């Protein structure tokens, strides 16, 4: 019941919105997981690990160069926006809206969301292997050596770029090798971030889950902490609810969400 939900919405003073790949998918962004998500011969799980980078940093960067560039043509969809405008509108009323996202495509920012927590990091940040510095970066290409590389055709030739010529740290005294500031498989989340998110979910009086499910990581870490306080939770995804069955609005976020937040 939508009207029931809006009645909550009305009251809410601290709203938290958790977002999964459903929403980045709706903007036409590859997640490279499950059927027909390949990049050349591989899937994410193969390449998004520290072992792969250690072993073959050109190839991993080729992969991430691609993902960086495909973004130039993918725009935020209506869900992205509806949220961003929501935050803005409510901000002005002294209410609060915070986004917690597992996505790394920066689409929330491009839609104009401000209080965003990127818990898997971002494609457009680099961390230095040497000095550990995190710096924004949207350069295209990120470095010359990679220009027009990362083609996804299964029979593409490896670039096999010398590690010295991949993206390096600019502090000169440093010149460390950069990696994407993304959480890979087998890595821990940043605790500073998680402590924040915790604080935010402890304060929230309404929680949305969008393009993923409360039941699965990462929603699962938290929705429990909020639900157990008795706070309403509203899913917006395309997963199915069985006949006999807090709120759940089946359908593409692009469609379901903006009416909800109006």
């Amino acid at each position: 019941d939508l009207t029931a939900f809006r009645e909550h919405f009305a009251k809410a003073k601290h709203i938290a919105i958790i977002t999964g790949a459903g929403v980045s998918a709706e903007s036409g962004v590859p997640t490279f997981r499950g059927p027909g998500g390949f990049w050349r011969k591989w899937q994410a799980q193969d390449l998004a690990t520290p072992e792969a980078f250690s072993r073959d940093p050109s190839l991993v960067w080729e992969f991430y160069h691609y993902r960086r560039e495909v973004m130039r043509s993918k725009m935020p969809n209506p869900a992205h926006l509806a949220i961003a405008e929501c935050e803005a509108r409510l901000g002005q009323q002294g209410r609060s809206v915070v986004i917690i996202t597992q996505n790394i495509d920066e689409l929330h920012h491009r839609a104009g969301s401000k209080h965003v927590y990127e818990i898997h990091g971002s494609l457009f940040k680099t961390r230095c292997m040497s000095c550990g510095e995190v710096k924004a970066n949207h350069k295209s290409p990120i470095c010359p050596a990679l220009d027009g590389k990362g083609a996804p055709d299964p029979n593409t030739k490896e670039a096999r770029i010398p590690v010295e010529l991949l993206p390096r740290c600019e502090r000169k005294s440093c010149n460390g090798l950069l990696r994407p500031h993304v959480v890979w498989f087998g890595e821990t989340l940043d605790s500073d971030i998680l402590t924040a998110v915790e604080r935010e979910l402890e304060k929230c009086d309404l929680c949305l889950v969008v393009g993923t499910s409360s039941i699965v990581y990462p929603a699962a870490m938290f929705a429990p902490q909020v639900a157990s306080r008795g706070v309403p939770v509203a899913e917006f995804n395309m997963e199915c609810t069985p006949a006999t069955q807090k709120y759940h609005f089946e359908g593409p976020c692009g469609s379901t969400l903006p009416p909800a937040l109006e």
Binding site: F185, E187, T188, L189, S191, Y217, P218, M221
Partner: peptide, 8 residues
């Protein structure tokens, strides 16, 4: 620290 996707 939390393994991502719970290590799975």
């Amino acid at each position: 620290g939390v393994l991502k996707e719970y290590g799975v």
